[PDB]
Amino acid sequence: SMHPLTDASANDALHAYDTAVKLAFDRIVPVLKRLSALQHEDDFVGRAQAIALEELGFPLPEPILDTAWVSQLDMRTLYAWCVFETYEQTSEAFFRDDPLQGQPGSPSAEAFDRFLLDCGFHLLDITPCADGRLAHAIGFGLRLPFSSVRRRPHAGALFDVENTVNRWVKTEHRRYREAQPNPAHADTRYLKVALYHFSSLDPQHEGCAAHGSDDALAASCGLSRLKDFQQAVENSFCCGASVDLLLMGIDTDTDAIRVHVPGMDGSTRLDRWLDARDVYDATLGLPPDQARQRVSALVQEAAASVPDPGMVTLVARLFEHNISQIDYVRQFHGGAYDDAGHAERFIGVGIGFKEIHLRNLTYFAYMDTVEEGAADLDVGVKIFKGLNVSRGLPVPVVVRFDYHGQVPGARDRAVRHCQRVQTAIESRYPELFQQGLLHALLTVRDQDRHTPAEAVGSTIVF
Amino acid sequence: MHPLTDASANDALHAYDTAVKLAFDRIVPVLKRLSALQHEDDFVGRAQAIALEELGFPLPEPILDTAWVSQLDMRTLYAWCVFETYEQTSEAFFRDDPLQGQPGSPSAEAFDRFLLDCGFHLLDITPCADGRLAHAIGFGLRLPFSSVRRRPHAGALFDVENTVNRWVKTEHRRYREAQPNPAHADTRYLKVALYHFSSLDPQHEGCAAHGSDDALAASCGLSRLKDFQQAVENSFCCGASVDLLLMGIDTDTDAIRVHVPGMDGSTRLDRWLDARDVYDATLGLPPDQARQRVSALVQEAAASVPDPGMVTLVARLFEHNISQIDYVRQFHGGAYDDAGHAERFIGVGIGFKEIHLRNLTYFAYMDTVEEGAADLDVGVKIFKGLNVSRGLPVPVVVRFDYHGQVPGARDRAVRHCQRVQTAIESRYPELFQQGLLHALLTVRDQDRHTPAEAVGSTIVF
Ligand SMILES: O=C(COP(=O)(O)O)[C@H](O)[C@H](O)COP(=O)(O)O
Ligand SMILES: O=C(COP(=O)(O)O)[C@H](O)[C@H](O)COP(=O)(O)O
Ligand SMILES: [Zn+2]
Ligand SMILES: [Zn+2]
Ligand SMILES: [Zn+2]
Numbered sequence: 050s051m052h053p054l055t056d057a058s059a060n061d062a063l064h065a066y067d068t069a070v071k072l073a074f075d076r077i078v079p080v081l082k083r084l085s086a087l088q089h090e091d092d093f094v095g096r097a098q099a100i101a102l103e104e105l106g107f108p109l110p111e112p113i114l115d116t117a118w119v120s121q122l123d124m125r126t127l128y129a130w131c132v133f134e135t136y137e138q139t140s141e142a143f144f145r146d147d148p149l150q151g152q153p154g155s156p157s158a159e160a161f162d163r164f165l166l167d168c169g170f171h172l173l174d175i176t177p178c179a180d181g182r183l184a185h186a187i188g189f190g191l192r193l194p195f196s197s198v199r200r201r202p203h204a205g206a207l208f209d210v211e212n213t214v215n216r217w218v219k220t221e222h223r224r225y226r227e228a229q230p231n232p233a234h235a236d237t238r239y240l241k242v243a244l245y246h247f248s249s250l251d252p253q254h255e256g257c258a259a260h261g262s263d264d265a266l267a268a269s270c271g272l273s274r275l276k277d278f279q280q281a282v283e284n285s286f287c288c289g290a291s292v293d294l295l296l297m298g299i300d301t302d303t304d305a306i307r308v309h310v311p312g313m314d315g316s317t318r319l320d321r322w323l324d325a326r327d328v329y330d331a332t333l334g335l336p337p338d339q340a341r342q343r344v345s346a347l348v349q350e351a352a353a354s355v356p357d358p359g360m361v362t363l364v365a366r367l368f369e370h371n372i373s374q375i376d377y378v379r380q381f382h383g384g385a386y387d388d389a390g391h392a393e394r395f396i397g398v399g400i401g402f403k404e405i406h407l408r409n410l411t412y413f414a415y416m417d418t419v420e421e422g423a424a425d426l427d428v429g430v431k432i433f434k435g436l437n438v439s440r441g442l443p444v445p446v447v448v449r450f451d452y453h454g455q456v457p458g459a460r461d462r463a464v465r466h467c468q469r470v471q472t473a474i475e476s477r478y479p480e481l482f483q484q485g486l487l488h489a490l491l492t493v494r495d496q497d498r499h500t501p502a503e504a505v506g507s508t509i510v511f
Numbered sequence: 512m513h514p515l516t517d518a519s520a521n522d523a524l525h526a527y528d529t530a531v532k533l534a535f536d537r538i539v540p541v542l543k544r545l546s547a548l549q550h551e552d553d554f555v556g557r558a559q560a561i562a563l564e565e566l567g568f569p570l571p572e573p574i575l576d577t578a579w580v581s582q583l584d585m586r587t588l589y590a591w592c593v594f595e596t597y598e599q600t601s602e603a604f605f606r607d608d609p610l611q612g613q614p615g616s617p618s619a620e621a622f623d624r625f626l627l628d629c630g631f632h633l634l635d636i637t638p639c640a641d642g643r644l645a646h647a648i649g650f651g652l653r654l655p656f657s658s659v660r661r662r663p664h665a666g667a668l669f670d671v672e673n674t675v676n677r678w679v680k681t682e683h684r685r686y687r688e689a690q691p692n693p694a695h696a697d698t699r700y701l702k703v704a705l706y707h708f709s710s711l712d713p714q715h716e717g718c719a720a721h722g723s724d725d726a727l728a729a730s731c732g733l734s735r736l737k738d739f740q741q742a743v744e745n746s747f748c749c750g751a752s753v754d755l756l757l758m759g760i761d762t763d764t765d766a767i768r769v770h771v772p773g774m775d776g777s778t779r780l781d782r783w784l785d786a787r788d789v790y791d792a793t794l795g796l797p798p799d800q801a802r803q804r805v806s807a808l809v810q811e812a813a814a815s816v817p818d819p820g821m822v823t824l825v826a827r828l829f830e831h832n833i834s835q836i837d838y839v840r841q842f843h844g845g846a847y848d849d850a851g852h853a854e855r856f857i858g859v860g861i862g863f864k865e866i867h868l869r870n871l872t873y874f875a876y877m878d879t880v881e882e883g884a885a886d887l888d889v890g891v892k893i894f895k896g897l898n899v900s901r902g903l904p905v906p907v908v909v910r911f912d913y914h915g916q917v918p919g920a921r922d923r924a925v926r927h928c929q930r931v932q933t934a935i936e937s938r939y940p941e942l943f944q945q946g947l948l949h950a951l952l953t954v955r956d957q958d959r960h961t962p963a964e965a966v967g968s969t970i971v972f
Contacts, residue, residue, distance in 0.1 A: 085579040086550045124580045439573075439972075441580035 050376040052333055054340050054369055056192070060377045063189060066148040067407055070139055074394045074410075077131045078442075080104050081124055088122040107134045112511045125443045129488035130509055132395050132445040136490070137504060143404040144501040151194030153499050158194035162230060164366065165197070166237060168359030170293065171230045172220050174199040175242040176208040176274075178257055178267070179401075179413040179425070181393040182301045183246055188406035189377070190304050192370035195406060196499070202401045203415050204425045205259030206243045206271045213241065213278045214285060217292065240363075241278055242295040243271035248389065250302045255389050258428065264298070268309070268319050272296045279315055293360070297367075298322070302385050304374045305329075308364055312354035323351040325371045332372075344368050392436065395445035396429045398422075399470065402449055403494060404502070411447075419473035430478060430487075438486050446474060446489040449502065454495035464505045467491035471508065482508075513790060514798050515805075515830055516837040517653070524650055525842050527609045528868050531600055534566070535855045535871075538592045539903075541565045542585055549583045568595055573972050586904045590949035591970050593856055593906040597951070598965060604865035605962040612655030614960050619655035623691065625827070626658065629820030631754065632691050632698040633681050635660040637669040637735075638705035639718055639728070640874045640886075642854040643762040647705055649867040650838065651765055653831035656867060657960075663862050664876050665886045666720030667704045667732040674702065675742050678753065702739055703756040704732035709850065711763040716850055719889070725759075729780055733757045733770075740776055754821065758828075759783070763846045765839045766790070767832045769825050773815030784812035786832045793833075805829050852897065856906040857890045859931065863910055864955060865963070872908075880934030891939060891948075899947050907935065907950040910963065915956030925966045928952035932969065943969070 050057045084097050094114045101109045110130060113123050142148070151158050165173055173193075177183040179202040187193050187200055199216070201208055217239050225233040245267040248255035256262030260270060275294040282292050294315040299306045305325040311317040328347055332340035345365045349356065378384060386408070393412040397405065405411045412429045416422025433444040448470050452463035471489050481487040491506035512518060545558045555575045562570050571591060574584050605613075612618050626634055634654075638644040640663040648654050648661055660677070662669055678700050685694040692698060706728040709716030717723030721731060736755045743753050755776035760767045768783040789808055793801035809825045810817065839845060847869070854873040858866065866872045873890040877883035894905040909931045913924035932950050935943075942948035949970055955963035 082579050086552070089550065121582045128580075441577040 050373070050380055052329060052372050052376050053335065053337050054332065055373040055376040057376075059192070060373060060380065062148075062150075063377065064381050067185075070407055070410065073135050073139065074132065076104065077128065077135065081127055081131065084127075085122055085124055088117050093117070105131060105134070106138065110509065110511060123485070125441070125485040126488070126509060129443050129445050133447070133488075133490045133504075133507070133509075136395060136445075136447055140404050141501050144499065149188050149195055149406060151188065151196055153196045155194060155196070158196045161194050161197040165240075165363070166231055166235075168363040169237050169357070170240040170359065170363065171224065171235070171237040172199065172239050173197070173242065174201060174213070174216065174239065175244060176201045176203055176206050177244040177299075178202065178206045178246055178259065179204045179415055180246060180257065180301070181391060181409050181412045183244070183299065183408075184405050184410060184413070185304075185408040186244060186299055189408070190299055190306060190371060190374050191367050192373060195403075200401055202413055204428075205257055205267060206245050206274065207259075208243070208274055208278075210274065210277045210281055214281050217282055238291065238293040239282075240293045240295060241275060242297060243275050245271045245296075245298045246301050247298055248302050249300045249305075250385060250389060255301065265319065268296065268298060272309075272317060272319060276315070293357070295360075295364070302389060304371070304378050306367065306371045308348075308351075308367070310348055310352040310356055310364060311360065312352055313357045313360075316353050318353045321351070321353065323347060323368075325368055325375060328368050329372050329375055341365070341369060391432045393432070395447050396426070396433060397447045397449060398426055398429070398474075399449040399467075400451045400494075402447075403451070403496075416470070419470055419477075423477060426474075426477075430481070438481075443486045443488055444481065446487065448474075448489055448491045449494065450492075451494050451496040454497040456497075460493060460495070463493045464491070467493060467505060471506065475508070513794055513833050513837050514796060515793065515801050516834040520653070521834055521838045521841060523609075524838065528646075528650075531868055531871070534596050534600065535593065537565055538589065538596065542588060542592070545588075546583060546585060549578050554578065566592065566596070568599070571970075571972065584946075586902070586946045587949070587970055590904045590906050594908070594949075594951045594965075594968065594970070597856065597908060601863075601865045601953075602962045605960065610649045610656055610867060612649065612657055614657045616655060616657070619657045622655050622658040626701075626824070627692060627698065629824040630698050630818065631701040631820065631824065632685065632696070633660065633700050634658065634703065635662060635674065635677065635701065636703045636705060637662045637664055637667050637732075638760075639663065639667045639707055639720065640665050640876055641707060641718065641762070642852060642870050642873045644705065644707055644760065644869075645872060645874070646867050646869045647760060650869070651760055651767060651832060651835050652828050653834060656864075661862055663874055665883075665889075666718055666728060667706050667735070668720070669704070669735055669739075671735060671738045671742055674739050675746060678743055699752065699754040700743075701754045701756060702736060703758060704736050706732045706757075706759045707762050708759055709763055710761045710766075711846055711850060716762065726780070729757065729759060729770075733778055733780060736776070736778075754818070756821075756825070763850060765832070765835045767828065769809070769812070769829070771809055771813040771817060771825055772821065773813060774818045774821075777814045779814045782812070782814070784808060784829075786829050786836060789829050790833050790836055802826070802830060852893050854890075854893075854897070856908055857887075857894060858908050858910060859887060859935075860910040860928075861912045863908075864912075864957075877931075880931060880938060884938060887935075887938075891942075899942070904946060905942065905948045907948065908953060909935075909950055910953050910955065912955050912957040915958040921954060921956065924954040925952070928954060928966055932967070936969070 050060055087093050097114050098108050113126055175198055177186045187198055188195055223229050246257055247264040253262055256264055257267040260267040279292050279294055282290050296309045296317050297306055307322040307324040309317040309322045328344055332343050345361060348361050348365045388409055392409045394410055397411040397413045398416055412432055414425035414429050430444055437444055448467050450463040450466050452459040474489055475482055478487050489508045492502045492504050494502040544561055548554055548557055558575055559569045574588055636659055638647045648656055648659055681700060684690050707718055708725040715723055718728040721727040736757060740753050740755055744751055755772060757770045757778050758767055766786040768785040770778045770783050772778045789805055793804045806826045810822050849870050853870040855871055858872045858874045859877055875886040875890050898905055909928050911924040911927050913920040935950055939948050952967040953963045953965055
């Protein structure tokens with residue numbers, strides 16, 4: 050890679066990972082086209098199974114192939130099935146092989162938690178925008194181990210203030226009772242980050258659709274939620290409780306971040322920021338340790354007003370990491386992603402997917418209640434009415450809910466919550482359903498341990 | 512062949528009718544060939560090449576490129592092919608003038624002069640909208656299309672009040688431009704009502720707007736004619752009148768019959784002069800005499816002493832219709848086998864300037880669906896038997912004329928078309944959702960002689 054701070058080996062491993070997962074999804078349609086052409090031939094059911102097993106790595110539903118002759122092979126359902134099975138194998142390998150090398154207990158996960166405490170933060174809770182183009186922001190954009198971070202995605206970065214406050218009490222409680230992540234009377238803070246995005250190449254149409262592609266607006270709402278969380282904590286607990294804040298954006302064309310370096314008490318400005326492109330150039334010609342020393346100087350000078358020193362160290366580390374992602378896009382994507390808009394393979398709805406860390410793989414819509422999250426799901430369906438329905442393909446929806454395995458009943462409740470979402474989806478797009486253009490897979494994840502999600506129902510039935 | 516038949520004209524018109532009808536009827540056979548090929552590797556390539564050869568255009572690629580999922584969407588291709596065929600048909604009408612009767616054509620200039628000599632400064636014709644009469648002007652009466660206002664209506668029930676308004680507009684143009692002639696000149700506006708009947712099966716193949724009763728269709732057509740005249744005479748001072756002509760046509764043979772009127776439009780409903788008796792009466796005569804005998808026959812069939820120019824003009828229509836009688840004997844055995852409805856698409860809105868062939872278009876006049884949905888429902892039921900019976904969609908072409916001098920009239924017309932489309936999609940949601948009904952939106956600038964313009968479609972990509 051060109052920049053002396055860039056992790057060339059990591060760019061290689063990351064690039065192979067992205068390429069392999071995308072290829073698995075992209076070979077579905079060529080395989081299914083080939084199958085469609087065989088549906089009148091002699092041993093089609095047998096032939097199809099062996100073809101699918103050999104080129105997709107999993108079989109197809111026997112009763113679909115069996116019943117093709119009545120009307121025709123139901124490719125819409127087969128497409129959904131294959132997307133679902135590919136999601137499922139992808140997901141499995143994530144938990145089993147740790148492609149990002151960031152699982153709990155991994156060297157880089159423990160290391161980042163240690164560095165974080167060294168900067169005076171005992172938990173990094175980041176809300177990116179739920180835009181599928183930001184799904185790699187943690188693992189690729191900031192090169193952080195995914196298990197060292199609380200990732201809480203929302204459309205336009207509008208996280209839930211009340212639930213954040215509660216995550217803070219939980220965190221405080223484990224500090225008091227288990228000294229995890231650290232002792233309770235250590236001088237560390239909860240750090241809440243909001244991460245907006247924008248398009249340098251098409252600043253006006255390809256930005257954050259939840260804020261009308263107005264960069265200034267997405268940054269303002271993002272900061273406004275940060276400030277509310279901070280105020281909520283101070284007003285809700287005795288003895289000067291507080292949190293730290295960080296506002297950031299990322300360019301969906303180049304993956305370069307920009308940061309509004311705050312001053313000690315959270316003071317940040319919306320019109321001033323440090324851009325990673327600018328940092329990258331100021332250091333491109335230096336030895337690593339001198340480049341690193343310049344990043345700190347730049348972050349320090351860029352502070353809205355006198356900043357907290359740990360904040361400088363952490364923020365400097367994020368720029369150092371993003372530099373690798375900047376070279377990544379330059380070295381693998383001509384300096385600008387050809388898929389500037391939405392190109393996602395399936396819609397994910399419910400709780401953020403622990404295991405999705407790839408750009409443009411999943412259009413995510415958060416929803417804890419259906420009658421509360423329909424809007425974002427609607428934006429996602431209309432996106433896919435273009436990506437998929439226009440090609441004759443259905444809209445593959447993957448429902449997710451985490452649960453605490455160590456709580457009796459929790460798994461069954463989450464499974465029953467998956468089903469009310471499915472029931473709600475079926476009511477809401479009744480036409481798309483009827484026609485075979487919308488399908489749902491239900492999944493649940495024991496968040497109490499590092500284990501694969503598990504499928505617990507589907508709109509595909511035999 | 513009759514001594515008065517224009518042989519070569521009969522060939523040219525036949526060559527035209529068979530050409531356009533071939534274009535439309537080649538569609539199904541092509542789509543049948545494509546359907547057989549949709550599992551082959553090079554399907555898209557082979558289909559495009561078949562369509563170019565056969566229909567002369569290629570197909571929407573999205574529909575071919577995705578046939579492997581749903582299967583090949585024939586209903587939508589068929590509609591799209593009918594629309595594309597209509598566009599090529601229509602564009603070539605204005606480009607090539609197959610009838611040799613556009614504005615400024617020698618034929619049109621000749622006939623405009625002849626109408627003036629007969630004492631008439633405008634010829635306004637309402638045939639029943641029935642698809643079996645769309646060729647009445649160009650084939651049946653051999654008139655240049657542009658020398659004539661054609662105003663079709665179900666059962667020939669034209670708008671009395673709007674016709675008076677057309678008379679007013681005509682006089683005004685005589686006053687201000689002396690076009691077609693000075694206002695003081697002793698000419699009259701001529702309104703014609705053309706009803707039809709079936710000589711082979713009079714009980715069921717007649718004018719369905721009037722229950723296939725010949726008398727009712729004849730008498731309602733006259734009722735409108737009288738009412739128009741009475742309306743002019745009552746609404747303006749001084750002279751203020753119009754001339755009238757009630758005619759029918761047999762849809763089995765294309766013979767006309769004229770109720771020759773007295774000078775003041777005195778028309779008898781029970782007595783007519785049938786072109787078949789004219790035909791037989793003059794068949795053994797050399798042309799010069801045959802023309803004389805047609806004259807004396809029209810003179811003698813008048814209800815009371817006729818106007819001299821009316822006698823001349825009606826004699827010319829008989830002389831002209833005798834060729835069309837020979838036409839149907841030559842190329843249709845003396846009786847069309849498509850005795851009934853065999854139209855290739857529904858047309859709604861204003862009459863189609865460019866449509867002049869028998870059983871090509873089921874036309875439903877309407878300003879809005881809210882009115883004349885009855886007339887549209889009739890067509891839709893018919894195309895359930897013609898197209899939905901065999902799995903094909905019902906193709907609708909909406910047309911509105913607008914004055915391409917009024918600023919924004921084109922815009923107004925386009926929005927009028929979409930207003931109709933919404934109303935149609937609401938009237939037949941079952942067919943529309945099952946993809947068994949599609950609409951093409953066309954507007955035509957009626958201030959000059961250019962082709963209509965396609966402005967939207969239910970087929971969407
Ligand atoms: O970070 C999140 C939230 O969203 P995402 O899955 O996108 O990261 C997970 O809940 C982690 O497992 C937290 O760890 P724990 O549940 O043990 O506190
Ligand atoms: O009656 C007609 C033609 O009847 P049809 O359209 O049914 O053949 C009109 O005189 C003109 O054509 C209208 O406008 P324009 O002068 O532009 O043609
Ligand atoms: Zn087949
Ligand atoms: Zn966004
Ligand atoms: Zn009729």
